[PDB]
Tab-separated table of C-alpha atoms and ligand atoms in Angstrom:
chain	number	residue	atom	x	y	z
A	1	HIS	CA	-4.395	4.989	105.230
A	2	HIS	CA	-6.932	2.253	104.465
A	3	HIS	CA	-10.266	3.688	105.710
A	4	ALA	CA	-11.495	0.191	106.674
A	5	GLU	CA	-9.613	0.411	110.006
A	6	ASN	CA	-11.735	3.300	111.345
A	7	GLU	CA	-14.889	2.517	99.381
A	8	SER	CA	-14.039	5.629	97.301
A	9	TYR	CA	-16.804	7.827	98.710
A	10	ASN	CA	-15.172	7.477	102.126
A	11	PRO	CA	-13.251	10.706	102.943
A	12	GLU	CA	-10.405	8.586	104.411
A	13	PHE	CA	-10.115	6.338	101.324
A	14	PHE	CA	-6.398	5.822	100.967
A	15	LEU	CA	-5.982	7.337	97.497
A	16	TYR	CA	-6.941	10.853	98.610
A	17	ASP	CA	-3.780	11.338	100.703
A	18	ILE	CA	-1.706	10.022	97.811
A	19	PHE	CA	-3.258	12.436	95.323
A	20	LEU	CA	-2.933	15.315	97.823
A	21	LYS	CA	0.747	14.790	98.634
A	22	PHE	CA	1.375	14.811	94.878
A	23	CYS	CA	-0.731	17.941	94.346
A	24	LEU	CA	0.967	19.783	97.203
A	25	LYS	CA	4.383	18.951	95.725
A	26	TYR	CA	3.877	19.522	91.997
A	27	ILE	CA	0.656	21.422	91.204
A	28	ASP	CA	-0.090	25.146	91.480
A	29	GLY	CA	-2.190	26.071	94.497
A	30	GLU	CA	-4.967	27.823	92.611
A	31	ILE	CA	-5.142	24.907	90.142
A	32	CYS	CA	-5.515	22.449	93.045
A	33	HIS	CA	-8.392	24.588	94.306
A	34	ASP	CA	-10.082	24.677	90.868
A	35	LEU	CA	-9.846	20.879	90.725
A	36	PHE	CA	-11.406	20.615	94.177
A	37	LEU	CA	-14.282	22.894	93.169
A	38	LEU	CA	-14.754	20.921	89.927
A	39	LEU	CA	-15.076	17.639	91.827
A	40	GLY	CA	-17.597	19.324	94.139
A	41	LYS	CA	-19.527	20.851	91.237
A	42	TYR	CA	-20.105	17.339	89.836
A	43	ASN	CA	-20.917	15.908	93.316
A	44	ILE	CA	-18.048	13.408	93.172
A	45	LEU	CA	-16.308	14.435	96.372
A	46	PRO	CA	-16.379	11.814	99.148
A	47	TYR	CA	-18.809	12.312	101.990
A	48	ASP	CA	-19.037	11.578	105.715
A	49	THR	CA	-21.668	9.016	106.645
A	50	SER	CA	-21.620	9.505	110.424
A	51	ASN	CA	-24.178	10.940	112.755
A	52	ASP	CA	-22.264	13.444	114.813
A	53	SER	CA	-22.016	13.187	118.587
A	54	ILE	CA	-24.782	15.142	120.280
A	55	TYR	CA	-22.182	15.954	122.980
A	56	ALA	CA	-20.128	18.073	120.558
A	57	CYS	CA	-23.005	20.184	119.271
A	58	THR	CA	-22.794	23.919	119.937
A	59	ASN	CA	-24.742	27.115	119.388
A	60	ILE	CA	-24.410	30.859	118.878
A	61	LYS	CA	-27.729	32.361	119.878
A	62	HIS	CA	-30.380	30.429	117.887
A	63	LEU	CA	-27.820	28.935	115.450
A	64	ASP	CA	-27.646	25.242	116.372
A	65	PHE	CA	-24.472	23.784	114.871
A	66	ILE	CA	-24.623	20.005	114.520
A	67	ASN	CA	-20.854	19.847	115.182
A	68	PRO	CA	-18.294	22.526	115.914
A	69	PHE	CA	-16.448	22.589	112.557
A	70	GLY	CA	-17.247	24.829	109.601
A	71	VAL	CA	-15.293	25.979	106.564
A	72	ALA	CA	-14.026	29.577	106.745
A	73	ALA	CA	-14.659	32.305	104.213
A	74	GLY	CA	-12.570	32.446	101.048
A	75	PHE	CA	-12.766	28.707	100.343
A	76	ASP	CA	-16.073	28.705	98.392
A	77	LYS	CA	-16.036	32.398	97.439
A	78	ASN	CA	-18.928	32.021	94.969
A	79	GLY	CA	-21.117	29.480	96.714
A	80	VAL	CA	-20.674	26.909	93.922
A	81	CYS	CA	-19.624	23.990	96.113
A	82	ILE	CA	-21.765	24.307	99.238
A	83	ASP	CA	-23.446	20.891	99.389
A	84	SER	CA	-20.311	18.932	98.637
A	85	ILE	CA	-18.117	20.794	101.107
A	86	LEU	CA	-20.728	20.433	103.862
A	87	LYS	CA	-21.123	16.720	103.121
A	88	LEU	CA	-17.400	16.155	103.931
A	89	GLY	CA	-18.553	16.409	107.565
A	90	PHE	CA	-18.788	20.164	108.268
A	91	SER	CA	-21.729	21.753	110.091
A	92	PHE	CA	-21.519	25.082	108.265
A	93	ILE	CA	-19.740	27.149	105.632
A	94	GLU	CA	-19.158	30.882	105.259
A	95	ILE	CA	-19.285	31.671	101.534
A	96	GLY	CA	-17.731	34.807	100.157
A	97	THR	CA	-16.343	37.244	100.696
A	98	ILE	CA	-18.637	38.723	98.093
A	99	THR	CA	-18.734	42.279	96.765
A	100	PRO	CA	-21.574	44.084	94.912
A	101	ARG	CA	-19.890	43.808	91.515
A	102	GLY	CA	-17.711	40.865	90.482
A	103	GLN	CA	-13.910	41.143	90.541
A	104	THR	CA	-11.181	38.914	89.184
A	105	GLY	CA	-8.928	39.941	92.085
A	106	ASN	CA	-5.265	40.850	92.253
A	107	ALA	CA	-2.808	39.575	89.694
A	108	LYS	CA	-1.330	36.073	89.796
A	109	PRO	CA	0.539	34.265	91.108
A	110	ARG	CA	-1.145	35.208	94.367
A	111	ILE	CA	-1.402	32.056	96.495
A	112	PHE	CA	1.523	30.041	97.840
A	113	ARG	CA	1.690	27.076	100.209
A	114	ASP	CA	4.468	25.850	102.457
A	115	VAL	CA	3.845	22.221	103.410
A	116	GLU	CA	6.686	22.097	105.950
A	117	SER	CA	5.147	24.821	108.146
A	118	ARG	CA	1.531	24.032	107.145
A	119	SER	CA	1.205	27.670	106.106
A	120	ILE	CA	-0.362	29.631	103.266
A	121	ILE	CA	0.153	33.193	102.044
A	122	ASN	CA	-2.369	34.878	99.783
A	123	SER	CA	-3.004	38.206	98.072
A	124	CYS	CA	-6.240	37.172	96.343
A	125	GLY	CA	-8.090	40.526	96.578
A	126	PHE	CA	-11.759	39.448	96.814
A	127	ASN	CA	-12.025	37.438	93.613
A	128	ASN	CA	-15.738	36.710	93.226
A	129	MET	CA	-18.544	36.671	90.694
A	130	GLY	CA	-20.352	39.507	92.464
A	131	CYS	CA	-23.264	39.591	94.902
A	132	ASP	CA	-25.987	39.048	92.315
A	133	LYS	CA	-24.554	35.878	90.766
A	134	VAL	CA	-23.504	34.416	94.126
A	135	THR	CA	-27.042	35.103	95.355
A	136	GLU	CA	-28.330	32.918	92.503
A	137	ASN	CA	-25.859	30.222	93.557
A	138	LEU	CA	-27.065	30.351	97.160
A	139	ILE	CA	-30.719	30.247	96.092
A	140	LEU	CA	-30.021	27.043	94.153
A	141	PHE	CA	-28.519	25.593	97.325
A	142	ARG	CA	-31.495	26.686	99.423
A	143	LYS	CA	-33.877	24.988	96.982
A	144	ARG	CA	-31.903	21.730	97.085
A	145	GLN	CA	-31.825	22.001	100.906
A	146	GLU	CA	-35.616	22.365	101.034
A	147	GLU	CA	-35.858	18.913	99.422
A	148	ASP	CA	-32.942	17.081	101.082
A	149	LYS	CA	-33.651	16.327	104.742
A	150	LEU	CA	-29.966	15.504	105.152
A	151	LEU	CA	-29.053	19.216	104.735
A	152	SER	CA	-31.861	20.861	106.698
A	153	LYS	CA	-29.750	21.651	109.815
A	154	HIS	CA	-26.606	22.789	108.022
A	155	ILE	CA	-25.808	26.496	108.225
A	156	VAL	CA	-24.623	28.928	105.544
A	157	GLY	CA	-23.259	32.335	106.473
A	158	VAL	CA	-22.290	34.984	103.921
A	159	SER	CA	-19.183	37.129	104.216
A	160	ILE	CA	-19.674	40.586	102.705
A	161	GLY	CA	-17.170	43.244	101.818
A	162	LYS	CA	-16.547	46.075	99.342
A	163	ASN	CA	-15.394	46.423	95.790
A	164	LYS	CA	-11.838	47.675	95.447
A	165	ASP	CA	-12.835	51.058	94.042
A	166	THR	CA	-15.803	51.784	96.299
A	167	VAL	CA	-15.384	54.891	98.452
A	168	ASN	CA	-17.965	54.230	101.254
A	169	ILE	CA	-17.879	50.610	102.403
A	170	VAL	CA	-21.370	50.975	103.895
A	171	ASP	CA	-22.943	51.371	100.462
A	172	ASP	CA	-21.508	48.019	99.371
A	173	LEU	CA	-22.443	46.305	102.638
A	174	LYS	CA	-26.060	47.496	102.320
A	175	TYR	CA	-26.189	46.370	98.683
A	176	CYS	CA	-25.199	42.837	99.678
A	177	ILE	CA	-27.708	42.756	102.577
A	178	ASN	CA	-30.618	43.747	100.357
A	179	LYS	CA	-29.814	41.081	97.772
A	180	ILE	CA	-28.461	38.059	99.673
A	181	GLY	CA	-29.409	38.700	103.327
A	182	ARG	CA	-32.712	36.812	103.173
A	183	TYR	CA	-30.841	33.591	102.202
A	184	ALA	CA	-28.183	33.895	104.909
A	185	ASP	CA	-28.222	32.367	108.385
A	186	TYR	CA	-25.659	34.970	109.354
A	187	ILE	CA	-23.747	37.826	107.757
A	188	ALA	CA	-20.011	38.224	108.377
A	189	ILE	CA	-18.765	41.776	107.957
A	190	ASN	CA	-15.251	41.627	106.544
A	191	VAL	CA	-13.221	44.629	107.693
A	192	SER	CA	-10.018	42.540	108.001
A	193	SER	CA	-8.805	41.311	104.582
A	194	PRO	CA	-5.200	42.551	104.168
A	195	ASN	CA	-5.508	42.549	100.356
A	196	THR	CA	-7.996	45.384	99.760
A	197	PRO	CA	-6.298	48.753	100.367
A	198	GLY	CA	-7.776	50.709	103.252
A	199	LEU	CA	-10.232	47.990	104.311
A	200	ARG	CA	-8.580	47.357	107.703
A	201	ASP	CA	-8.942	51.047	108.572
A	202	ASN	CA	-12.622	50.276	109.177
A	203	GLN	CA	-11.591	48.499	112.398
A	204	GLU	CA	-11.235	51.937	113.953
A	205	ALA	CA	-13.878	52.206	116.691
A	206	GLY	CA	-15.927	55.081	115.241
A	207	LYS	CA	-16.002	53.625	111.729
A	208	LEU	CA	-16.724	50.133	113.051
A	209	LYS	CA	-19.639	51.344	115.150
A	210	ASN	CA	-21.316	53.040	112.197
A	211	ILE	CA	-20.665	49.974	110.021
A	212	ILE	CA	-22.273	47.590	112.512
A	213	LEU	CA	-25.272	49.838	113.195
A	214	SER	CA	-25.792	50.426	109.441
A	215	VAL	CA	-25.693	46.680	108.721
A	216	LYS	CA	-28.096	45.881	111.553
A	217	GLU	CA	-30.440	48.685	110.432
A	218	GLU	CA	-30.449	47.344	106.858
A	219	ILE	CA	-31.250	43.817	107.995
A	220	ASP	CA	-34.020	45.184	110.225
A	221	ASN	CA	-35.471	47.149	107.270
A	222	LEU	CA	-35.333	44.071	105.034
A	223	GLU	CA	-37.629	42.418	107.578
A	224	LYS	CA	-39.981	45.396	108.140
A	225	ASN	CA	-40.549	45.867	104.404
A	226	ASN	CA	-41.098	42.236	103.423
A	227	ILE	CA	-42.682	40.224	106.287
A	228	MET	CA	-46.180	40.496	104.794
A	229	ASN	CA	-45.002	39.161	101.447
A	230	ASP	CA	-46.661	35.945	100.355
A	231	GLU	CA	-43.291	34.192	99.979
A	232	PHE	CA	-41.755	33.678	103.420
A	233	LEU	CA	-38.962	36.152	103.973
A	234	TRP	CA	-36.196	34.043	105.560
A	235	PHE	CA	-35.317	31.349	103.013
A	236	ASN	CA	-32.465	30.017	105.155
A	237	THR	CA	-31.835	27.303	107.759
A	238	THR	CA	-32.851	29.255	110.834
A	239	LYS	CA	-35.999	30.762	109.279
A	240	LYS	CA	-35.013	33.964	111.108
A	241	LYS	CA	-33.271	37.202	110.170
A	242	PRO	CA	-29.506	36.665	109.801
A	243	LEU	CA	-27.233	37.194	112.770
A	244	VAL	CA	-24.375	39.666	112.346
A	245	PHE	CA	-20.724	38.829	112.950
A	246	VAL	CA	-17.590	40.900	112.499
A	247	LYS	CA	-14.331	39.330	111.329
A	248	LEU	CA	-11.283	40.995	112.847
A	249	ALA	CA	-7.606	41.069	111.905
A	250	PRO	CA	-4.994	39.873	114.416
A	251	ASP	CA	-2.704	42.807	113.549
A	252	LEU	CA	-3.992	45.310	116.107
A	253	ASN	CA	-2.551	46.802	119.255
A	254	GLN	CA	-4.114	46.374	122.699
A	255	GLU	CA	-5.790	49.787	122.661
A	256	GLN	CA	-7.498	49.079	119.340
A	257	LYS	CA	-8.637	45.703	120.628
A	258	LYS	CA	-10.142	47.306	123.731
A	259	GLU	CA	-11.893	50.082	121.763
A	260	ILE	CA	-13.336	47.512	119.322
A	261	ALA	CA	-14.620	45.387	122.231
A	262	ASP	CA	-16.387	48.423	123.715
A	263	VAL	CA	-18.074	48.969	120.338
A	264	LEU	CA	-19.104	45.305	120.054
A	265	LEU	CA	-20.723	45.487	123.498
A	266	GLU	CA	-22.569	48.730	122.732
A	267	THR	CA	-23.817	47.690	119.252
A	268	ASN	CA	-24.822	44.189	120.380
A	269	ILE	CA	-22.988	42.285	117.629
A	270	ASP	CA	-23.968	38.600	117.619
A	271	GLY	CA	-20.474	37.175	117.274
A	272	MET	CA	-16.871	37.877	116.417
A	273	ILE	CA	-14.702	35.827	114.063
A	274	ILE	CA	-11.169	35.738	115.487
A	275	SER	CA	-9.301	35.965	113.234
A	276	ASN	CA	-8.326	36.745	109.643
A	277	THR	CA	-4.824	36.239	108.256
A	278	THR	CA	-1.760	38.025	109.619
A	279	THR	CA	0.849	40.204	107.960
A	280	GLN	CA	3.277	39.971	110.878
A	281	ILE	CA	4.954	36.587	110.165
A	282	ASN	CA	8.563	36.718	108.951
A	283	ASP	CA	10.255	33.344	109.447
A	284	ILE	CA	8.862	31.458	106.435
A	285	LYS	CA	11.786	31.394	104.023
A	286	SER	CA	9.712	30.450	100.955
A	287	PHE	CA	7.315	33.386	101.556
A	288	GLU	CA	10.020	36.076	101.837
A	289	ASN	CA	9.400	37.422	98.332
A	290	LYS	CA	5.639	37.371	98.722
A	291	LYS	CA	2.780	39.733	99.554
A	292	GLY	CA	-0.372	39.199	101.570
A	293	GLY	CA	-1.825	37.499	104.622
A	294	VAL	CA	-0.511	34.317	106.228
A	295	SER	CA	-2.764	31.423	107.291
A	296	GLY	CA	-2.034	28.088	108.907
A	297	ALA	CA	-0.007	26.670	111.728
A	298	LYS	CA	2.069	29.793	112.218
A	299	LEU	CA	-1.180	31.733	112.911
A	300	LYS	CA	-2.411	29.392	115.671
A	301	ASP	CA	-0.852	30.924	118.779
A	302	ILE	CA	-1.424	34.498	117.604
A	303	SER	CA	-5.097	33.935	117.020
A	304	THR	CA	-5.650	31.841	120.159
A	305	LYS	CA	-4.153	34.624	122.273
A	306	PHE	CA	-6.419	37.103	120.421
A	307	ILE	CA	-9.455	35.011	121.361
A	308	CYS	CA	-8.415	35.080	125.028
A	309	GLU	CA	-8.015	38.857	124.796
A	310	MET	CA	-11.379	39.646	123.191
A	311	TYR	CA	-13.242	37.151	125.396
A	312	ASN	CA	-11.974	39.102	128.394
A	313	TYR	CA	-12.348	42.565	126.815
A	314	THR	CA	-16.001	41.868	125.943
A	315	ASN	CA	-16.516	40.339	129.413
A	316	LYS	CA	-17.623	37.040	127.806
A	317	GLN	CA	-20.758	38.665	126.335
A	318	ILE	CA	-19.927	38.238	122.625
A	319	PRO	CA	-19.768	34.698	121.146
A	320	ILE	CA	-16.545	33.815	119.319
A	321	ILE	CA	-16.006	31.974	116.055
A	322	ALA	CA	-12.394	30.679	115.979
A	323	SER	CA	-10.253	30.896	112.789
A	324	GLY	CA	-6.495	30.356	112.648
A	325	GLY	CA	-4.227	27.337	112.483
A	326	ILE	CA	-6.764	24.745	113.643
A	327	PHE	CA	-5.598	21.297	112.463
A	328	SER	CA	-6.156	18.807	115.306
A	329	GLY	CA	-8.711	18.091	117.984
A	330	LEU	CA	-6.219	19.520	120.453
A	331	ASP	CA	-6.007	22.753	118.445
A	332	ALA	CA	-9.795	22.936	118.410
A	333	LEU	CA	-10.119	22.383	122.155
A	334	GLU	CA	-7.552	25.115	122.822
A	335	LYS	CA	-9.695	27.579	120.840
A	336	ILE	CA	-12.873	26.540	122.687
A	337	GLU	CA	-11.271	26.652	126.120
A	338	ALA	CA	-9.891	30.065	125.125
A	339	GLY	CA	-13.466	31.296	124.519
A	340	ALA	CA	-14.619	30.054	121.105
A	341	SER	CA	-18.043	28.467	120.625
A	342	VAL	CA	-17.287	27.102	117.165
A	343	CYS	CA	-14.292	26.567	114.856
A	344	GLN	CA	-13.628	27.338	111.192
A	345	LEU	CA	-11.115	25.431	109.078
A	346	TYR	CA	-9.244	26.572	105.987
A	347	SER	CA	-5.575	25.528	106.001
A	348	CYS	CA	-6.518	22.180	107.561
A	349	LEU	CA	-8.669	21.404	104.515
A	350	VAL	CA	-5.782	22.327	102.181
A	351	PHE	CA	-3.137	20.213	103.940
A	352	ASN	CA	-5.277	17.313	105.235
A	353	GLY	CA	-7.811	17.218	102.408
A	354	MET	CA	-10.960	15.143	102.180
A	355	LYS	CA	-10.589	13.538	105.648
A	356	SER	CA	-10.284	16.916	107.444
A	357	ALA	CA	-13.669	16.996	109.153
A	358	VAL	CA	-13.957	13.270	109.902
A	359	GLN	CA	-10.535	13.224	111.532
A	360	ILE	CA	-10.804	16.396	113.572
A	361	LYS	CA	-14.289	15.517	114.823
A	362	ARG	CA	-13.004	12.124	115.988
A	363	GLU	CA	-9.999	13.708	117.692
A	364	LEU	CA	-12.143	16.301	119.528
A	365	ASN	CA	-14.645	13.700	120.780
A	366	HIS	CA	-11.866	11.538	122.204
A	367	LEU	CA	-10.330	14.572	123.887
A	368	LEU	CA	-13.653	15.563	125.438
A	369	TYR	CA	-13.770	11.995	126.824
A	370	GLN	CA	-10.203	12.088	128.139
A	371	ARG	CA	-10.567	15.589	129.628
A	372	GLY	CA	-13.726	14.623	131.518
A	373	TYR	CA	-16.172	17.045	129.858
A	374	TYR	CA	-19.820	16.029	129.657
A	375	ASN	CA	-20.199	18.068	126.469
A	376	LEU	CA	-18.411	20.668	124.377
A	377	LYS	CA	-20.439	23.582	125.736
A	378	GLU	CA	-18.973	22.899	129.202
A	379	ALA	CA	-15.486	23.582	127.806
A	380	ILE	CA	-16.240	26.995	126.314
A	381	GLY	CA	-13.983	29.514	128.000
A	382	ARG	CA	-12.774	27.076	130.649
A	383	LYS	CA	-9.224	28.407	130.286
A	384	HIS	CA	-10.449	31.521	132.117
B	1	FMN	C1	-6.628	31.858	99.600
B	1	FMN	C2	-7.369	32.416	100.797
B	1	FMN	C3	-8.494	33.208	100.576
B	1	FMN	C4	-9.185	33.749	101.681
B	1	FMN	N1	-10.273	34.549	101.449
B	1	FMN	C5	-10.978	35.050	102.541
B	1	FMN	C6	-12.096	35.810	102.307
B	1	FMN	O1	-12.472	36.043	101.165
B	1	FMN	N2	-12.789	36.338	103.362
B	1	FMN	C7	-12.393	36.087	104.646
B	1	FMN	O2	-13.050	36.580	105.575
B	1	FMN	N3	-11.279	35.323	104.903
B	1	FMN	C8	-10.583	34.782	103.834
B	1	FMN	N4	-9.489	33.998	104.077
B	1	FMN	C9	-9.056	33.717	105.501
B	1	FMN	C10	-9.659	32.402	106.044
B	1	FMN	O3	-11.094	32.530	106.038
B	1	FMN	C11	-9.132	32.111	107.441
B	1	FMN	O4	-9.632	33.145	108.267
B	1	FMN	C12	-7.595	32.089	107.558
B	1	FMN	O5	-7.059	31.397	106.446
B	1	FMN	C13	-7.097	31.513	108.890
B	1	FMN	O6	-7.544	30.186	109.100
B	1	FMN	P1	-6.555	28.914	108.812
B	1	FMN	O7	-5.312	29.193	109.599
B	1	FMN	O8	-7.367	27.763	109.373
B	1	FMN	O9	-6.288	28.851	107.331
B	1	FMN	C14	-8.787	33.485	102.974
B	1	FMN	C15	-7.692	32.668	103.192
B	1	FMN	C16	-6.973	32.137	102.098
B	1	FMN	C17	-5.773	31.262	102.374
B	2	XCM	C1	-9.038	30.631	97.069
B	2	XCM	C2	-7.845	29.651	96.903
B	2	XCM	C3	-7.340	28.686	97.774
B	2	XCM	C4	-6.244	28.075	97.112
B	2	XCM	C5	-5.295	26.961	97.596
B	2	XCM	C6	-4.609	27.200	98.950
B	2	XCM	N1	-6.126	25.754	97.703
B	2	XCM	C7	-5.506	24.432	97.667
B	2	XCM	O1	-4.338	24.312	97.576
B	2	XCM	C8	-6.471	23.261	97.805
B	2	XCM	N2	-7.814	23.391	97.809
B	2	XCM	C9	-8.410	22.178	97.988
B	2	XCM	C10	-7.377	21.278	98.100
B	2	XCM	C11	-7.598	19.785	98.325
B	2	XCM	C12	-7.509	18.801	97.130
B	2	XCM	C13	-7.497	19.372	95.830
B	2	XCM	C14	-7.401	18.527	94.704
B	2	XCM	C15	-7.294	17.163	94.962
B	2	XCM	C16	-7.194	16.131	93.827
B	2	XCM	F1	-8.292	15.309	93.765
B	2	XCM	F2	-7.057	16.811	92.673
B	2	XCM	F3	-6.116	15.375	94.124
B	2	XCM	N3	-7.282	16.664	96.190
B	2	XCM	C17	-7.354	17.421	97.268
B	2	XCM	C18	-7.168	19.622	99.780
B	2	XCM	C19	-8.453	18.933	99.288
B	2	XCM	C20	-6.175	21.916	98.001
B	2	XCM	C21	-4.792	21.238	98.067
B	2	XCM	N4	-6.123	28.633	95.901
B	2	XCM	N5	-7.102	29.582	95.797
B	3	ORO	O1	-9.729	37.801	99.098
B	3	ORO	C1	-8.675	37.917	99.787
B	3	ORO	O2	-7.579	38.244	99.273
B	3	ORO	C2	-8.656	37.714	101.295
B	3	ORO	C3	-9.668	38.172	102.063
B	3	ORO	C4	-9.593	37.999	103.428
B	3	ORO	O3	-10.458	38.406	104.140
B	3	ORO	N1	-8.525	37.388	103.981
B	3	ORO	C5	-7.510	36.938	103.206
B	3	ORO	O4	-6.575	36.399	103.719
B	3	ORO	N2	-7.594	37.110	101.863
């Protein structure tokens, strides 16, 4: 895997795969992740030195993604590794999920990998330093961005959720908006983690509608009450108020999916993230003892079908962010042709490591060539 065919700051430098195979075999998952974050904290991760193809750029409303690959929520929960993760070759990252107060999360061990099936199962429970500290972390990023031209088009979304013991989710969502919203290019509303009791209940149509409208109202009030401030309000990439996405769980029946789509149309959500982890996977022997949501290759078909379903149920009016089992350029094109405008990676970064973005971007470009597309946007929804 000598990178020279396509030194150490190259994401495909041959030692990374060697270290990763060893880590995946012998080293606890959460310790591997700590080591990754530590390398990123000290800016010693490798970095991608390519200009991305202009023919694989994509957008959701005014968000102009330089390429179609971001890192999904839950990878940099605290926003401590934003620059270094982006510089691996990703166009955006969704930090969080954050909650108003910090939490250490559910008890360990709580994360388990299965290399054979390229799957993960987790019961993390929203481990994060809390909205106020993560807001300081994001502000530090936004200040570095302001000075580094190389980062000026990269996007940062923030996933928001509730503390375990909070009764009304809306209170926690509004708290996060008023503290971190002005530094976000978009807000992702997390009503789909399987590891916070009762959170998924908020996918019910009536509750979801009130959640979306409350979040939009709070963002709109943030603007109204602060535009005239001397310091410009939107200290983000877009220089506009954050868009609002909802992240949905794949474990829903067809009637729930249809009622949610009706709500998304009425409330004018800006995007839907399809999807979070699933609790409906049984045939992973090494996970049989274990609690939580499953990610990875065994989630691919489930979530791709879910994209097709919500694209049609929303009559193609709500942009889609794809999450679930994306590893290859083929996987990515299947999500886009199913309806997605943009892809998020998580398991691919765990199992393929530092080369994840370089490799998948290369694979997608070649496929767009072979398939005869002029650009990526032409492929969106072409399955339908
Ligand atoms: C350890 C772990 C923590 C996660 N934490 C979050 C989270 O905090 N918020 C969220 O919206 N999704 C979270 N996810 C889900 C991912 O963002 C992603 O939606 C999911 O893993 C499916 O994508 P993949 O198959 O590419 O891994 C987490 C996933 C894992 C494995
Ligand atoms: C929230 C959460 C997620 C997790 C688990 C699922 N994350 C991981 O397994 C993980 N994350 C990052 C890595 C990579 C890495 C890590 C270390 C090294 C080395 F340099 F040390 F070799 N190389 C490569 C893949 C790049 C891995 C294997 N736990 N908790
Ligand atoms: O923090 C977690 O446990 C978590 C959140 C989420 O949204 N999805 C997930 O799989 N885990």
